[PDB]
Design a protein around this ligand. Structure first.
Ligand SMILES: O=C(O)CNC(=O)C(=O)O
Ligand SMILES: [Mg+2]
Ligand code: NI
Ligand SMILES: [Zn+2]
Length: 331
């Protein structure tokens, strides 16, 4: 069995190997990369996502989200308070202000210590989940707006044609902006490209151990767990690495820098935080190996998770027993 300790693997494809996206994902899996839940892909040196980032300041962040924490420094929830619209130029200036800027630090480890000590005492503003792309249309390799769609994969594997579309999302971050512990919708893959700015630190639980994280989360968030049998689908709970180690939960960590891709694998729980002003692009995707995860994915039916249009068909086809309850939660 490849990668039996479920370490995060880092790949350096050549320009030739960068041509065929599906083939390369399958290669990484042949080497055991999915056992970690997360892999890093460093593009060949010949590649670029676009020519420059000099002209992005007029992008609008229609609904910036202030991420307000409740709890203790290592075990907390966050809720999102909606703020007034602002441009990417305005958001960048805000990120760099004295109130929000990254503190002085020695290295990534010192900054990680500072994040876990102090996150809860601040409420950073995240420009998350903005439909759009920063890949140039002429970028033919690993262009996250030109991937094969999940609807087409389901149709190729299962023979059923379904409605829905699959487009990327932009994320504009600042120091301490945070992504809570989650797997993807329908336990899909994700791919995330850090276009510019400061790093993103990731934490991940191997898919084979995801239920250990779920059991800890039910213990640590007991109100939330009574409310919903899949409350991590609400994407609000944070647990620090120290607390994970105290409770024997297997995990790994890595820091993504600008110009790098990360891939999350089906049922790989992940969480993390941004170091300072940055912009990432991410999208979900599927492969043949995903189908069995999609069929078994948990679902939130309490009302909280509320998701895209395109999840309907995935539930309806892959999980017909669950469909009626889940759809009630959508309505
Ligand atoms: O970058 C973020 O805030 C969150 N990203 C992801 O969870 C992802 O790409 O799967
Ligand atoms: Mg612009
Ligand atoms: Ni994710
Ligand atoms: Zn729920």
């Amino acid at each position: 069995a490849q990668n039996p300790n479920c370490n995060i693997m880092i790949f350096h494809p050549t320009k030739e190997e960068f041509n065929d996206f599906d083939k390369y994902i399958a290669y990484m899996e042949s080497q055991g990369a999915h056992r970690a839940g997360l892999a890093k892909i460093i593009p060949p040196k010949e590649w670029k996502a676009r020519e420059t980032y000099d002209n992005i300041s007029e992008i609008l962040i229609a609904t910036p989200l202030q991420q307000v924490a409740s709890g203790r420094a290592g075990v907390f929830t966050q809720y999102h308070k909606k703020k007034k619209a602002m441009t990417v130029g305005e958001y960048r200036h805000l990120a760099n202000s004295k109130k929000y800027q990254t503190p002085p630090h020695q290295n990534f480890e010192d900054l990680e210590r500072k994040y876990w000590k102090n996150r809860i005492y601040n409420s950073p503003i995240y420009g998350a989940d903005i439909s759009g792309s920063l890949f140039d249309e002429n970028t033919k390799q690993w262009n996250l707006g030109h991937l094969g769609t999940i609807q087409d994969l389901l149709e190729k594997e299962c023979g059923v044609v379904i409605e829905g579309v699959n487009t990327p999302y932009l994320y504009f971050g600042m120091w301490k902006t945070t992504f809570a512990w989650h797997t993807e919708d329908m336990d899909l893959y994700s791919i995330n490209y850090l276009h510019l700015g400061e790093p993103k630190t990731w934490y991940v639980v191997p898919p084979e151990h995801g239920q250990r994280l779920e059991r800890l989360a039910r213990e640590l968030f007991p109100g939330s767990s009574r409310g919903c049998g899949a409350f991590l689908r609400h994407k609000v709970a944070l647990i620090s690495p120290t607390v994970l180690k105290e409770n024997g939960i297997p995990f790994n960590r890595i820091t993504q820098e600008a110009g790098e891709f990360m891939v999350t694998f089906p049922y790989g729980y992940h969480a993390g935080f941004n170091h300072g002003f940055n912009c990432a692009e991410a999208i979900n995707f599927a492969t043949p190996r995903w189908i069995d995860y999609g069929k078994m994915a948990s679902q939130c039916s309490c009302g909280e998770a509320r998701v895209t249009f395109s999840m309907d068909a995935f539930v309806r086809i892959l999980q017909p027993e669950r469909y009626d309850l889940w759809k009630r939660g959508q309505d």
